[PDB]
Amino acid sequence: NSFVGLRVVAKWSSNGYFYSGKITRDVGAGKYKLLFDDGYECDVLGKDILLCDPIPLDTEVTALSEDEYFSAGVVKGHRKESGELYYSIEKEGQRKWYKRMAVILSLEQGNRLREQYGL
Amino acid sequence: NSFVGLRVVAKWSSNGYFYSGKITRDVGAGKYKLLFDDGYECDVLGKDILLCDPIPLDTEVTALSEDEYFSAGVVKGHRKESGELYYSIEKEGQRKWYKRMAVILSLEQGNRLREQYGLG
Numbered sequence: 001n002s003f004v005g006l007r008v009v010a011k012w013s014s015n016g017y018f019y020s021g022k023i024t025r026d027v028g029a030g031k032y033k034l035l036f037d038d039g040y041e042c043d044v045l046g047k048d049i050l051l052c053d054p055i056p057l058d059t060e061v062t063a064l065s066e067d068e069y070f071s072a073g074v075v076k077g078h079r080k081e082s083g084e085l086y087y088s089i090e091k092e093g094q095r096k097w098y099k100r101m102a103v104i105l106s107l108e109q110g111n112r113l114r115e116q117y118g119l
Numbered sequence: 120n121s122f123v124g125l126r127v128v129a130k131w132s133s134n135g136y137f138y139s140g141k142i143t144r145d146v147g148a149g150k151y152k153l154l155f156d157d158g159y160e161c162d163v164l165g166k167d168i169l170l171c172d173p174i175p176l177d178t179e180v181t182a183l184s185e186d187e188y189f190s191a192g193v194v195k196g197h198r199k200e201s202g203e204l205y206y207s208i209e210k211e212g213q214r215k216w217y218k219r220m221a222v223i224l225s226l227e228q229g230n231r232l233r234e235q236y237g238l239g
């Protein structure tokens with residue numbers, strides 16, 4: 001029906017990763033208003049949005065941690081705890097839990113989901 | 120005595136909120152290149168930068184959680200675990216742990232620290 005209200009990962013800047021967010025409006029012209037998990041709002045083109053909630057298992061992602069901006073890993077599990085999604089990210093045979101907000105996609109990583117989940 | 124490499128919380132303008140980041144370069148004219156914890160890098164005015172690392176105790180902050188964008192609380196503790204900073208945020212007599220990345224400041228909350236920690 002309508003994509004309003006659905007969670008997504010979307011790239012809002014040219015030099016940008018894909019970040020967890022939520023569609024809030026269909027603003028026409030192939031654009032949607034997005035609400036990122038950090039509270040920032042802006043319009044984003046459909047081609048720059050991946051309709052993923054959660055990011056699928058076996059997906060290569062970037063898991064953010066303090067002083068780590070490019071740590072790549074593979075999603076191997078999801079878990080709901082007190083209404084919050086957690087990702088189990090495998091890196092070098094070891095799995096660690098990350099909150100939804102900390103799991104992002106580089107350009108190359110997002111392009112692998114574009115054909116199946118892009119708008 | 121330079122500011123490059125120091126962690127900060129810096130305003131975003133579009134919404135007025137201060138986010139956790141790091142000064143990576145002095146670009147002149149009172150501006151600094153800032154790398155936010157999410158990996159986005161841009162120039163920011165010094166008056167919009169708070170030299171807070173960590174955000175001091177008893178500060179009123181906004182603590183992000185899933186589908187929560189305006190939940191306010193008070194910092195009552197800090198904890199380093201595996202080289203990562205965690206904030207203990209009190210709200211309604213209960214405390215919960217948040218990672219550095221999830222603790223932000225609204226414009227009003229950040230203005231309370233401008234006098235003491237701002238780079239204006």
Ligand SMILES: CC(C)(C)NCCCNC(=O)c1cccc(I)c1
Nearest residue numbers: 019036037038040138155156157159
């Ligand atoms: C407004 C700025 C430029 C700070 N971010 C916008 C895009 C990222 N939004 C997020 O959801 C997020 C996730 C983790 C950490 C941080 I900081 C932000």
